[PDB]
Amino acid sequence: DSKAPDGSVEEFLMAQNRFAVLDRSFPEDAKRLRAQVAHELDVRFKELEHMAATNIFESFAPAGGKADGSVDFGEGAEFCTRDDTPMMARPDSGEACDQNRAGTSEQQGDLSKRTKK
Amino acid sequence: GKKMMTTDGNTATAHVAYAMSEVAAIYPITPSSTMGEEADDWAAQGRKNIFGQTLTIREMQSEAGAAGAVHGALAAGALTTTFTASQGLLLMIPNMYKISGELLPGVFHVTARAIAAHALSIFGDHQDIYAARQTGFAMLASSSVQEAHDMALVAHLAAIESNVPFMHFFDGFRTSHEIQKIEVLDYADMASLVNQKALAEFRAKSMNPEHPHVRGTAQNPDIYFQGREAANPYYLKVPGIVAEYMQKVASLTGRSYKLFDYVGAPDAERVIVSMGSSCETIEEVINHLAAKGEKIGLIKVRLYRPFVSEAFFAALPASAKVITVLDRTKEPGAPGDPLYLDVCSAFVERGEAMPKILAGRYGLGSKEFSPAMVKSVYDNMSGAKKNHFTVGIEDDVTGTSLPVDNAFADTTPKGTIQCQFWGLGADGTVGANKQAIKIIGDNTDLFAQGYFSYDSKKSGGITISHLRFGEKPIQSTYLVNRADYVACHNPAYVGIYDILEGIKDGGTFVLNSPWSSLEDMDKHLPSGIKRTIANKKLKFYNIDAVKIATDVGLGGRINMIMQTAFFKLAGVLPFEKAVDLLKKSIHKAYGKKGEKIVKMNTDAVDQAVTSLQEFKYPDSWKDAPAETKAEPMTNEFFKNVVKPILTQQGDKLPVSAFEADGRFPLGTSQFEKRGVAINVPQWVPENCIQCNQCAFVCPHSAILPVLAKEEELVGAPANFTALEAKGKELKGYKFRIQINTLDCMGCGNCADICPPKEKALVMQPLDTQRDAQVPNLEYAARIPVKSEVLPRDSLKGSQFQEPLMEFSGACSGCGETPYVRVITQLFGERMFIANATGCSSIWGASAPSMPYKTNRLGQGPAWGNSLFEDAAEYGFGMNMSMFARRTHLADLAAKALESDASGDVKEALQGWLAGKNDPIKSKEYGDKLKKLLAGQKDGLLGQIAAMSDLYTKKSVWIFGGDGWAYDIGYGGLDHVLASGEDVNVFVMDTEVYSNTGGQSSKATPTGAVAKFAAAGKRTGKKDLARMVMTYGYVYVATVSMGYSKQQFLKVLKEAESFPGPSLVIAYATCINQGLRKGMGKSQDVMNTAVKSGYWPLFRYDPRLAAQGKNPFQLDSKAPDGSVEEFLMAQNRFAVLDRSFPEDAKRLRAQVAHELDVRFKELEHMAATNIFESFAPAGGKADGSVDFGEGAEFCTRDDTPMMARPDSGEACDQNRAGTSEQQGDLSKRTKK
Amino acid sequence: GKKMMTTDGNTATAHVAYAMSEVAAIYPITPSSTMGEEADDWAAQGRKNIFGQTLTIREMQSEAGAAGAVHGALAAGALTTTFTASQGLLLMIPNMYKISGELLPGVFHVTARAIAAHALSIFGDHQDIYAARQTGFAMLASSSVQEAHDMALVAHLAAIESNVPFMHFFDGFRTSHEIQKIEVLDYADMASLVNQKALAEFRAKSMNPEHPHVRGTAQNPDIYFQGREAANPYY
Amino acid sequence: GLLGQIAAMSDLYTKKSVWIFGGDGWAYDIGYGGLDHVLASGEDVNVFVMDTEVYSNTGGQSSKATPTGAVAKFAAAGKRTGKKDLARMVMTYGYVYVATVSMGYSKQQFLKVLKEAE
Amino acid sequence: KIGLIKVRLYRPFVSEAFFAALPASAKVITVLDRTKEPGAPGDPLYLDVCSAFVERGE
Ligand SMILES: Cc1ncc(C[n+]2csc(CCOP(=O)(O)OP(=O)(O)O)c2C)c(NO)n1
Ligand SMILES: Cc1ncc(C[n+]2csc(CCOP(=O)(O)OP(=O)(O)O)c2C)c(NO)n1
Ligand code: SF4
Ligand code: SF4
Ligand code: SF4
Ligand SMILES: [Ca+2]
Ligand SMILES: [Mg+2]
Ligand SMILES: [Mg+2]
């Protein structure tokens, strides 16, 4: 909504004591820092200009869906979804499952094949 | 009306909370998490509250955030609750003053849990609720599952009518996780007790622009004090409102309560005053002892705040000559704990008989408070009468403990059956027990009780169940110590844990094992057990549950067989009804897939009953010869401290055994060697290309690469096969991949990722590998690690470095541990780690197991866990200390340069100064100082000499999960990265609150199913990386091991070396994500996460900007189209698809779209030529200046807030207008 | 030596605090703000503490962030302080249990101020310090401008030797802002009262990769209670 | 009955406008974690930040909103880190309305933003 | 005949040092608390002092 830096930052900064005292006490550092501010806003503005010209933007869904129903992230999982800790214990936990101590499904599968009997 | 139900304190209270509330602002914290999760589940199922509405629940970023939202909802006219504990409650404190200060009817339900001091504890005690005793909240205690339900109802009702917020609390775990058969009220009955007039007034006085007011004013000394006292009338009436509601509820339930209730002998001489679950056990003991003539009693405190002295005396027997107040907390330095102090005040105020009061402390962190301990307390009042004592520990350093005699008789009511079950995590024991509680509770008049103890270990951990059944109410809020029935579901436990401890004579002990024959049984079964089985005439039963299961086809799952064992031999029910009942439940449950799966179970039962016969043992066992002690060599600390704890004997360690500040030594996990993997990798040297990827990938450091020169293999076992080392730099070396079979967890990542098609690593049953590999690893461990042969930060070279974090308690195939492990191979010897609470802190430092260790020189990560919310700040503090102390050192160094110090010293000092912040040089010159200044103890050189542990530059790291980084600690992380200082933050993104139960975090992606996002999270994943990249001066990068190990190392080296803030986000697979083919596919999944475009890798390096180049670099390719398969391969996405196909399709499409847009944006970033210049510093100088010096107008106001020592000078305060306006005006008036 | 000066409670205690600390993590809150600002001005001006160094002061995003930083600096062997009150002290409570729980020589200087309930107040009372009484911090009260200087000194010396963190407190405004002609001590005098061996032990037991340990473990019911009682000899 | 209950809820009939006011210290520092989380919630609320680029009321202390080179308490030689870019940070969500205003430059643009934000 | 006991070290509260400052002739003592804990049977300092007298048991 606004335009490119018009070049008056310096007078803008120097017109405020929060910047001016620095100038009166530490001239060298202050000029560097005021120059740094002019640089920052210069880069920022260019970035804002690019944002305004991009044609790369996320869509947008206001809401809608969910409805009645909820499912536990553990339901129907092939391997244990919770640990053996008191922290993950819940009223409905405690059922047997593959705790990943026997290896992958294919690994277990191939081991079976190799030991058949 | 009424309704019988078997649940725990949590669900029992959430039952009422849901009904009485319109809104809940929530945050998860153990052990209160279950409440919020049940509420969310019920809301989704369509459960209506007393207003016929579904509860409005939202999860906040922290408990501080929840307390604020709670305050908002209440101020805005809606009844509101929240559930919390420990650290969580502390964060609500500020808002509690506001909520009571504004007389709002809020209700907080809390699982009383210990506060972190010398250490963290998720267990139960009152340290947290007592910390809020001065906030103005009313405090009501429930001492049992049944009471939790009743008190939760009283609290809500009283809050509505009194306008005083309530905190309803019950003991963490001891009451919250104990399951009992209790009675609950329908919602309509709860509704009928609500004071409608008061409720209407609540809504009418609430915030609303149609009849507004202003709340939260700022007041001066003239009126604040009066304003604070104006609520007095409300607090004077709450006690009567509470008593009134206990009676109204009692008129519906038949269970009466008082502010303070008395139990025991009417003429008792010795009385206990207690609060919480301890009262149940205290009463059980009273009944027992009193029936023997002892004159004791107990005062149960219900309403702790306001404390009505009158009601307390109304319950005090006039004959009481001695009374002890039990406080479940410790307030260091206080003349006494909370309750004791309150009681003391009641007596001095009464100003009459002074019956001698004693203070006692008990149960910190769910410490057992058994009948024997109650006996101790009672004997104390008639004996020594030690004051300010502790019970439950042996205080051998200060002597404040009461001795405890465990020969005390069982005090459970006549006819109570007590059972104990020892199981292996994931074997289904707990589940079957919980099911057995229901079955029995729903089909008999028996009261049922269950309590479960778990493991700090996440995988292959031990579970021990405590179940009780009886004709009389169960008040035993302590573990079973004299069982009638003991079951050991894992043969391995037989010779490592005291399985039969306390088992009653004639009791029955069932064991799962293949030792069916008297020969095998005598071989594997230890002697002590035989001796015990014999001398107690126990009814021993062996059952090869693994064989039976396999036989009937259950595939080796033993839960159904052991369940049968319980029903048939426990003695709680007659065989007929028992087996009959079990079978009916088999059909009820299961029956999911035809009658096929059913039959297998019915069959399992039938065959279990038949095979279950009393194992007959010879009378010879009565004195079977004691064995030897083939115990390996290990630490004295491990010998005297950690092993005793690992074997469930921690309770016997006296306080003299611990460090006052709670610290633990590094590397105690080295000697655990648990051997819990079912299958471990077997090296096949014929196919090995000597790449070192297997060791790089291991979540536990179970793979040890060996690089030795023939001289080192002289005494190597015959089978220590070693290939000739490949590579021009490793000519004369021999190579070998040694497998640590006992530490391996059997996940399968190494084998799944091994390069050659003809795998060099193949999975095999542990038993087929240990004998050969145990003595092999023990030999390899003695071979010097060749850290100098290859570049430390190269893929192959890093595995030739000592890993400083091994054998942690992480799950098998954990996606976080591989990352930290290599990080330590790169900076381990000089790092500080400020670890956020979460999985990384639980596998990282759960006493007594400490995975982080020191290298050969004794150097290693200085590790610490402050809180969950402050990890970044904690690290920033470590950074500040280093800055100040090393600046001091530099100062001392510079002074020494200008002294007559020798030429060499000066040369070294000058070298150090020039390389102070460089890892290489600071160490190089620092090491010379250590040598040159050795022994020096006077003057400058002496001061410098004493600072050698500050010589080489340190590496400060902040470790944390996504929950910490994107939610609760985000504000802190943001501020610390913005400080521009040299710290390194490493975020292990599991896209969920893993540790606490898989709750949704802002790092959780669109459509992922997690707690509080059970229909698929409806907002996209928070982009933490792009947010901190807006600073321009912070190094930001994302990694994914499975995709590229080289980029990971590159990022590690770049982030650490960056002389400013670094943020690294790694994709970490987790069991909560439910990888369909096992966690052994983690590396593959990480790989796909990147290739699919889901988790793009990049690096934002500010020093490139400093040198005219683009700071942003893309490290991965555009989306390859595999998202759908990537997502569908994880249960967190697939469960949604099976339950809500439409939405699931939509959510997965959105995800594809989000990642597509994001990559495009990352592409333009990498192609941009618009970037800010960078400067690590430049300037400073000595001198300050105030913002108001020399200003033309006043720069500060007339407020007490801006007043400073130097203010008060006259200035133009802008009431005369502008400089020109004043000028022009002066001109226009001239005169 | 001794030196007569006219100042208020705030700067009288900051005089001591500056001298006795190496690090300070702060956040501004009335009426304690003056202390941190004085400390920052003096360091920027190059004033030396008893170690001949300028104070390392950083401003955090809140008092919770300040308390976390303080915990970290102490854990890493640096004498550290902070200035706070009211709502600010409340956010420090979690870390206070940690700081005392790990027996660190921290020192908090607070201008005791009213807590916000029915209304907010920047004025003085003990509602805030009483709210942190169970955290395990020793608590030393100064009832006058002259006492603030003296108790602040005692608090620092005692925390170093005892390993128990201290909270030195005085009334908001009534003492923090009252000015009086008092006597202060030179920094050399303060340095001479310091227990050198206790200070050295504090450095040597601090976090450092050269000689690591782990702190902040998670503990089960078997040992937590014993661990909480182990600190008794210190108290 | 029903009509009665509906009648008693007339102060809820018209849609309300929920506003959160706060300075830069609150938004960029102490309350940022909360602000970030609430904006990410997706709910209908409006936050208005009055940026003075300093903690004004308590005495002029620096905040992350303080710009490079500005003198303020704890920035007594000029702040040596630049202004935190709060705006670009919350603009990364994509579903949050974000705007900056300055009355003196344009009163019209300020009004338009109010209308669009609300 | 009146007096005042000034407390310097509030925590740890040392009863022994408290009593060393209390005149044996004291017949009435009032504890002034500069706070308000709603519902408490008394404010902090008061409660600490009451505890000192009960333990002394004289
Ligand atoms: C003040 C506070 N609120 C809540 C909690 C509980 N808590 C501890 S760890 C955790 C989840 C951590 O998630 P994450 O950060 O993503 O790491 P992880 O997934 O476990 O690896 C929670 C909710 C704590 N615990 O001191 N402290
Ligand atoms: C927990 C806490 N509370 C209060 C304060 C003190 N405080 C109040 S307002 C403020 C600065 C506000 O700055 P800002 O947000 O930029 O608004 P303003 O500039 O005055 O308009 C501080 C440091 C620090 N009052 O509850 N910490
Ligand atoms: S199976 Fe897993 S735990 Fe075992 S060595 Fe391989 S990567 Fe490590
Ligand atoms: S991953 Fe396979 S080829 Fe590579 S070092 Fe390990 S065993 Fe050898
Ligand atoms: S991050 Fe997941 S896989 Fe790793 S220890 Fe935690 S719960 Fe287990
Ligand atoms: Ca860095
Ligand atoms: Mg996580
Ligand atoms: Mg401001």
Please write down the HEC assignment for all residues of B855-913.
Answer: CCCCCCCEEECCCCCCHHHHHHHHHHHHHHHHHHHHHHHHHHHCCCCCHHHHHHHHHHH
Q: Which two tokens stand for residue B785?
A: 């690690």
Distance of alpha carbon B1122 from alpha carbon B191, whole angstroms: 53
How far, rounded to the nearest angstrom, does the alpha carbon of residue B112 sit from its chain's CA centroid?
A: 15
Subunit contact C210:B332, Cβ cutoff 8 A: no
Element spanning A108, H or E:
helix A105-115
CA distances from B804 to B745, B830, B857, B859, C174 (A): 18, 11, 12, 9, 55
What's the CA gap between B439 and B467, in Å, rounded? 13
CA end-to-end span of chain B: 93
Q: Which amino acid is at B1053?
A: K
| CB burial of residue B681 (10 Å; 0-12, 13-18, 19+) | buried
* Choice from B680, B750, B817, B1045 to test ligand 3 binding pocket (greatest atom count within 8 A of CB): B750
Q: How many CB atoms sit inside 10 A of residue B1193's CB?
A: 13
CA end-to-end distance (rounded Å), chain A: 77
Mutant choice from C126, C143, C166, C168 vs E, greatest count of E C-beta within 10 A: C126
Phi, psi (deg, nearest 5) at residue B168: -95, 125
Calculated CA dihedral for residues C88, C93, C99, C102, nearest 10 degrees: -170
Convert B10-48 into a string of H (helix), E (strand) and C (coil): HHHHHHHHHHHCCEEEECCCCCCHHHHHHHHHHHHHCCC
Q: Which chains border B (3 or more CB–CB pairs < 8 Å)?
A: A, C, D, E
Q: Which of B645, B463, B126, B661 is nearest to C223 (CA)?
A: B645
Q: How many residues does chain E have?
A: 58
Annotated binding-site residues of B read 30, 63, 113, 426-430, 458, 559, 601, 688, 691, 694, 698, 744, 747, 750, 754, 811, 814, 816, 839, 961-964, 982, 984, 990-995, 1055, 1058, 1060, 1062, 1070
**Chain D adjacent subunits, 3+ CB pairs under 8 A:** A, B, C
Q: What string of H, E and C letters represents the secondary structure of D12-69? A: HCCCCCCEEEEEHHHHHHHCHHHHHHHHHCCCCCEEEEECCCCECCCCCECCCCCCCC
Burial class (CB in 10 A: 0-12, 13-18, 19+), B856: exposed
Q: Is the dihedral of CA D107, D109, D110, D114 positive or negative?
A: positive
Q: Report the candidate in B261, B294, B286 with the shortest Cα–Cα distance to residue B275.
A: B261
User: Cβ distance A66 to B1019 under 8 Å?
Assistant: no
Ramachandran sector of residue B1099 (left: φ over 0; alpha: ψ -120 to 50; beta: rest): beta
DSSP code, position B1117 = P
Q: Could you give the CA distance from residue C136 to residue C128 in angstroms, rounded to a whole number?
A: 15
Locus of tokens 């994500």: B1073
Q: Determine contact, residues C101/C219, Cβ cutoff 8 Å.
A: no
Q: How far apart are CA A83 and CA A92, in angstroms?
A: 14
Tokens of B828: 């381990």
How many helices (H) and strands (E) in chain B?
43, 34
- The Cβ of residue B78 has, within 10 Å, a number of other Cβ atoms equal to 17
Is the sign of the CA dihedral B1171, B1173, B1176, B1179 positive or negative?
negative
Query: In terms of Cα–Cα distance, which of B861, B776, B851, B850 is closest to B826?
Result: B861
Cis upstream peptide for A5 (omega within 30°): no
Helix or strand run (H / E) with residue B636: helix B636-637
- What is the sign, positive or negative, of the torsion defined by CA atoms of B532, B534, B535, B539? positive
Closest CA to B1064 of B1176, B1175, B955, B922: B955
Q: Where are the alpha helices (DSSP H) in chain C?
A: 9-20, 33-44, 63-75, 86-101, 127-131, 145-162, 187-193, 196-205, 224-229
Peptide bond before residue E44 is cis, with ω within 30 degrees of 0 = no
Q: Any idea what DSSP says for residue E9?
A: E
Query: What residue has token string 């197991």?
Result: B849
Q: Which among B718, B824, B861 is positioned nearest to B776, based on CA atoms? A: B718
Q: What is the DSSP letter of B366?
A: G
Question: B785-1169 has which fold?
Answer: Rossmann fold (3.40.50)
- Gap from CA of C36 to ligand 2 centroid (Å): 15
Q: The domain B627-667 belongs to what CATH superfamily? A: Pyruvate-flavodoxin oxidoreductase, EKR domain (4.10.780.10)
Strands B1035-1039, B1098-1100: pairing is antiparallel
Q: Which CATH class is domain B1170-1231?
A: few secondary structures
Q: Could you give the CA distance from residue B1005 to residue C9 in angstroms, rounded to a whole number?
A: 53
B68 contacts on D by Cβ (under 8 Å)? 34
CA atoms of D47 and D39, how far apart (whole Å)? 9
Nearest to B37 by CA among B54, B51, B23, B57: B57
**What residue type is assigned to position B418 of the chain?**
Q
Beta bridge partners of C124: C113
Cβ atoms of B1072 and B995 within 8 Å: the answer is: no
Alpha-carbon B724 to chain mean position? 47
Query: CB–CB of B1196 and D59 under 8 A?
Result: yes
CA distance linking residue B877 with residue C66, whole number of Å? 9
Superfamily of domain B415-626: Pyruvate-ferredoxin oxidoreductase, PFOR, domain III (3.40.920.10)
Burial of B918 (0-12, 13-18, 19+ CB in 10 A): middle
Residue position matching structure tokens 């000519």:
B731
- Identify from C57, C59, C91 which residue to disrupt to test chain D contact, counting D C-beta atoms within 10 A and taking the largest count: C59
Resolution in A: 2.3
What whole-number distance in Å separates Cα of residue B177 and Cα of residue B451?
A: 7
> How far apart are the two ends of chain E, measured CA to CA in Å?
22
DSSP-derived pairing of the beta strands B539-543 and B357-362: unpaired
Question: Cα B793–B797–B798 angle (5° rounding)?
Answer: 60
Cβ–Cβ below 8 Å for E35 and C130: yes
- Cα B1152 to chain centroid distance, Å, stands at 34
Distance CA B441, CA B469 (A): 9
Which residue in this structure is represented by tokens 């401008």?
Answer: C145
Residue closest to B333 by CA, chosen among A41, C8, E12, C203: E12
Rounded CA gap, B138 and B479, in Å?
31
Class of the CATH-defined domain B1-257 = alpha beta
* Domain B258-414, CATH class in plain words: alpha beta
SS (H, E, C) B791-837: CCCCHHHHCCCCCCECCCCCCCCCCCHHHHHHHHHHHHHHEEEEECC
C-alpha B1119: how far from chain center: 37
Q: Is C166 helix (H, G, I), strand (E, B) or coil?
A: strand
Q: Write the residue in D42, D71, D82 that is nearest to A22 by C-beta.
A: D71
CB half-sphere exposure, B303, CA atoms < 13 A: 31
Question: Which of B53, B747, B843, B1218 is the mutation pick for testing A, counting most A CBs within 10 A?
Answer: B747
Fold (topology level) of A56-117: Pyruvate-ferredoxin Oxidoreductase; domain 7 (4.10.790)
Residues 6+ apart with CB under 8 A from B533: B500, B509, B540, B617, B621
Interatomic CA distance for residues B249 and B1076, integer angstroms:
50
CATH of domain C1-235: 3.40.50.970
Active site (catalytic) residues of B? 30, 63, 113, 995
Q: Which residue of C27, C29, C111 sits with most ligand 2 atoms within 8 Å of its CB, as the best mutation to test the pocket?
A: C29
Total H helices, total E strands in chain C: 9, 9
B/e letters for B705-739, b = 16+ CB within 10 Å, e = fewer, are bbbbeeebbeebeeebebeebeeeebeebbbbbbb
* Strands D46-50 vs C80-84: parallel, antiparallel or unpaired: unpaired
Cβ atoms B495, B629 nearer than 8 A: no
**b/e per residue B190-229 (b: at least 16 CB within 10 A):** beebbbeebeeebbeebeeeeeeeeeeeebeeeebeeebe
For the record, the structure tokens of B1161 come out as 């944006």
Q: Helix, strand or coil for residue B5? A: strand
Q: How far is D89 from chain B (nearest CA, A)?
A: 5
- The DSSP bridge pattern shows strands B733-739 and C80-84 to be unpaired
Closest residue to D92, CB basis, from B1023, B1201, B1204: B1023
Q: Which two tokens stand for residue C118?
A: 């029915």
List, in order, residues 6 or more apart from B895 with CB less than 8 Å away: B940
Hey, what are B550's tokens? 């396999």
Chain E nearest C-alpha distance from B134 (Å)? 5
Sign of CA dihedral C99, C101, C105, C110: positive
Give yes or no for a contact between B1124 and B984, defined as CB atoms under 8 angstroms apart.
no
B848 upstream amide cis, omega within 30 of 0:
yes
Is residue C6 exposed (0-12), middle (13-18) or buried (19+ Cβ within 10 Å)?
A: exposed
CA–CA distance, B483 with B571 (Å, rounded to integer): 12
At residue B627's C-alpha, the angle toward residues B623 and B628, to 5°, is: 150
Helix (H, G, I), strand (E, B) or coil at B290: helix
How far CA B16 is from CA of B7, B53, B135, B172, in Å, comes to: 13, 14, 24, 18
H or E element that contains D89: helix D86-90
DSSP class of residue A83 equals -
Q: Is B1080 touching ligand 1 by the criterion CB < 6 Å?
A: no
Residue whose tokens read 């002294």: B899
Residue-wise burial string across B491-516, b where 16 or more C-beta atoms lie within 10 A, e elsewhere: bebbeebebbebbeeebbbbbbbebe
Report yes or no: C42 and C18 within 8 Å, Cβ to Cβ: yes
C-alpha dihedral, B1090 to B1091 to B1096 to B1100, nearest 10°: 100
**Interface contact flag, D59 C29, Cβ < 8 Å:** no
Q: Residue ranges per domain, chain B? A: 1-257, 258-414, 415-626, 627-667, 668-784, 785-1169, 1170-1231
Of all residues in chain B, the one with the smallest CA distance to A27 is B1179
Name residues whose C-beta falls within 8 Å of residue C53's C-beta, 6 or more positions apart in sequence: B884, B887, B888, B891, C22
Cα angle B369-B661-C224, degrees, rounded to a multiple of 5: 20
The Cβ of residue B584 has, within 10 Å, a number of other Cβ atoms equal to 12
Distance B815 CA to ligand 5 centre (A): 7
Buried b (16+ CB within 10 A) or exposed e, B626-644: eeeeeeeeeeebbeebbbb
Q: What is the DSSP letter of D72?
A: B
Q: Which of D77, C56, C46, C14 is nearest to B1186 (CA)?
A: D77
Number of helices (H), then strands (E), belonging to chain E: the values are 2, 1
Out of A40, A47, A99, the one facing B425 most closely (by C-beta) is A99
Instruction: Please state, in angstroms and rounded to a whole number, the distance separating the CA atoms of residues B634 and B637.
Output: 9
Distances (CA, A) of D14 to B200, B214, B573, D21: 20, 21, 63, 22
Q: Do residues B601 and B554 lie in contact, with contact meaning Cβ atoms separated by under 8 Å?
A: yes
Measure the CA–CA gap between B798 and B808, rounded to whole angstroms: 20
What DSSP element (H or E) covers B703? strand B703-709
Rounded-to-integer distance, Cα C227 and Cα C218, Å: 11
Contact C39, C17 (CB under 8 A): yes
This entry's atomic model was obtained through: X-ray
Best residue among B674, B676, B680, B1081 to mutate for probing ligand 3, ranked by most atoms within 8 Å of CB: B680
> Cβ–Cβ contacts within 10 Å for residue B1145, how many?
14
Of B333, B356, B357, the CB nearest to E13: B333
| CATH topology for the B668-784 domain | Alpha-Beta Plaits (3.30.70)
The minimum-distance atom of ligand 1 relative to the CA of B1003 is: 16
d(CA C86, CA B93): 12
Residue A52 dihedral angles phi and psi, to the nearest 5°: -75, -25
Structure-token pair, residue B1137: 């698809």
Distance CA B299, CA B323 (A): 10
B405-437 b/e with 16+ CB inside 10 Å = b? eeebeebbbeebbbbbbbbbbbbbbbbbbbbbb
